Every structure is written in structure tokens, then in C-alpha cells.
Amino acid sequence: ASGNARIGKPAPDFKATAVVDGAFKEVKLSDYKGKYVVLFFYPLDFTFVCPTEIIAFSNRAEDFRKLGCEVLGVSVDSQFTHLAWINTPRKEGGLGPLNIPLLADVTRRLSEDYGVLKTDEGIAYRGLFIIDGKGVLRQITVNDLPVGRSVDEALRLVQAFQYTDEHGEVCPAGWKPGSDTIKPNVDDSKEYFSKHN
């Protein structure tokens, strides 16, 4: 529970202008029905931790796409500012060409609905949200401004939520593909407990 965002309930609906392959396009949550979505907010264009997180997610976008998961970034900056930043070379602090949409949240509606607006600055905190194929919010990750998130951890979480959805077993702490899972009932769970201890 962050703003209108609640784990286990339909993620707050959104619609925004975004920069997609160097052009402007409308992006909305209902477009991703049947797909997982990683939605990540960041405070500001033309800053420091920011480009490193956007570039990391862009570099791994294909890994998420192989899981039927779309990655979307969003800040309060306009789509014109985003495009300027994509048109700035990475060596100069820019983003260069990107493989993920960058959404504009100029009214702050998306940030307010997801509960990540840092009100004394008017910018979003590093809030990352994982939404399943039914549009349900499954995970919330929010960091204060000085520390970047982990793309590997986001990937692990998407893999774990898909695993539990598809198999009806739960994922222990630190689960990664290949790791044992637990059948969530008193008697069937003893198979895990007896083997891991």
C-alpha cells in the first residue's frame, strides 16, 4: 500500500504520453493486459543515479520481454525533456537510444496515485512496482534518492511471481530459477522442510 497502490488489488490505472523509439506515443496500463509490467519511477531527467537505472533497465529489457514482461520508466519530466535526454550521448550523462518507453508524468497524477511523490520537491522517489498479467499489484520497492535499485532483483521477483502463479507453490527467501519451492499446506510442506534441514 502506497498512495492508491495496494498489494493484491488492481494496480492504479494510468495513461501517459511516452517516448517510444524516439517518437511520442500514448501508453496505458490496459495495453499490457496478459503481460507482467515493471513500472519504475525516478526523480529527474538529466541527473545522476537516474540515467544509470534507466540504462540498466534498457540493457535488460530483452530479458524481461522473454518472460512476457514489459518495463516502463516514468518521471515528472515532460516527453520533450525525455527526448532531449535520449538524444544526449551516454558519455555526456545522457541516455542515448533506449529499448523501453519513458513516460511523462507532468500532472504528477501517476506519482500521486502510486504514492511516491516527494512532496517538498515535487519529484518521485525511486519507486518500482511489479504488476501481473491480470493487472494486480504484487510488489512494491521504494528507495530514497541516493541509492539505485537492482535490475537483477526486479528480474528475480518477476520470475518468482510467475513461478508461483503457474505452479501453485511458494518461493522461499532468495529463490532463483532451479531453487526448491514449497507446497503451501501443512503436510506437503514437510517434503521441503525435511530436505533443507
Catalytic annotation, residues: 50
**Minimal distance, residue 103 CB to a second copy, in Å:** 13
Nearer to a second copy, 31 or 87 (CB): 87
**Minimal distance, residue 32 CB to a second copy, in Å:** 18
CA distance 99 to 102: 9
**Minimal distance, residue 77 CB to a second copy, in Å:** 6
Report whether 111 contacts 32 (CB < 8 A). no
Sign of CA dihedral 184, 185, 190, 193: positive
What DSSP assignment string belongs to 60-90? HHHHHHTTTEEEEEEESS-HHHHHHHHTS-G
Sign of CA dihedral 87, 152, 72, 35: positive
Nearer to a second copy, 68 or 122 (CB): 122
Nearer to a second copy, 22 or 68 (CB): 22
**Minimal distance, residue 33 CB to a second copy, in Å:** 19
Nearer to a second copy, 178 or 186 (CB): 186
Residues in the chain whose C lies over 2.5 Å from the next residue's N (breaks after): none
